[model samples]
Target: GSSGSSGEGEKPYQCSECGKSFSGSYRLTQHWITHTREKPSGPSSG
Candidate 1:
C-alpha cells in the first residue's frame, strides 16, 4: 500500500532520522523503514 505513500501533504509525526513528516504515525513508521532499507515483511518471509 506504499505505492505513492508520502507524508508531505500534512503533519504531526516527523521522522527523527530525516525530519520528514507524516500525518499518521503508521505512515511515519512505514516511512522510517525506507531509511533502514527494511524489507517489508510479507507472507513468504513472515
Candidate 2:
C-alpha cells in the first residue's frame, strides 16, 4: 500500500525564543528577528 505522506499532517518548526512555530524553515528564520532585534547590513540609504 502506497500511503501518500507528502500531503499528510502539519510539520511545524518551533522557535525557542517566542514559542512560535512555523511550517517552513524560511518562516522560522524570519521569525527569529523578533528576538534578535538586529537588522541586516546593506547599502547605505540615500
Candidate 3:
C-alpha cells in the first residue's frame, strides 16, 4: 500500500536579501548573516 506522504510539500525558507530559497531554517539564517554581517569575527587565536 503506497498510502504514505512521500513528496507532499516543502516548507519555503526563502531569503529576502538575495531571493534564495533554503532547505532548512539554519541554512537560510546562515545566508542572512552573510548579507547583514551581524557578527564580523574571524580566527582570533593566531
Candidate 4:
C-alpha cells in the first residue's frame, strides 16, 4: 500500500557528488551547490 507520503525515519535522497546525505531530494539539490567555488552575491567594499 502506498501512503503517498514520506516516512518519519526515511532518508530518500543523497548527494552523489559528496558523501553528505540528505533527508529529501530537494535538500540534496540545494546542498550540491556548496561543492562548487561559486561565491554568494552580497555587499562588497569599494
Maximum-lDDT candidate = 1
Task: Tell me how far the alpha carbon of residue 8 in candidate 1 is from the true structure, in angstroms, after superposition.
Answer: 15
Error of 2 at 39 (Å): 12
Error at 32, model 3, angstroms: 0.4
Worst 10 residues of 1 by lDDT: 1-10
Candidate 1 lDDT over 1-46, as tens digits, reads 5445663354668776567987788888878887677555666432
Q: Alpha-carbon error at 7 in model 1, in Å? A: 19
For model 3, where is the 10-residue window of minimal lDDT? 2-11
lDDT of each: 0.69, 0.68, 0.67, 0.65
* Model 2 segments more than 4 A misplaced: 1-12, 38-46
lDDT (10s digit) by residue, model 3, range 1-46:
5456545444588765456778888898878877765454866334
Candidate 4 scores a C-alpha RMSD against the true structure in Å of: 10.2
Q: In angstroms, give how far residue 11 of model 3 lies from its true place.
A: 5.7
Residue 34 CA error for candidate 3 (Å)?
1.6
Ranking by lDDT: 1, 2, 3, 4
TM-score of 2: 0.49
In model 2, the worst 10-residue window by lDDT is 2-11
lDDT of 4 at 32: 86
1-46: candidate 2 lDDT, tens digit per residue: 5457544443477775446768788999888877677564866344
The alpha-carbon deviation from the true structure for residue 12 of candidate 2, after best TM-score superposition, in angstroms, is 5.4
The residue-level lDDT of candidate 3 at 20 comes to 74
Highest TM-score, which number? 2
Query: How far off is residue 36 in model 2, in Å?
Result: 1.1
Candidate closer to the true structure by lDDT (higher is better), 1 or 2? 1
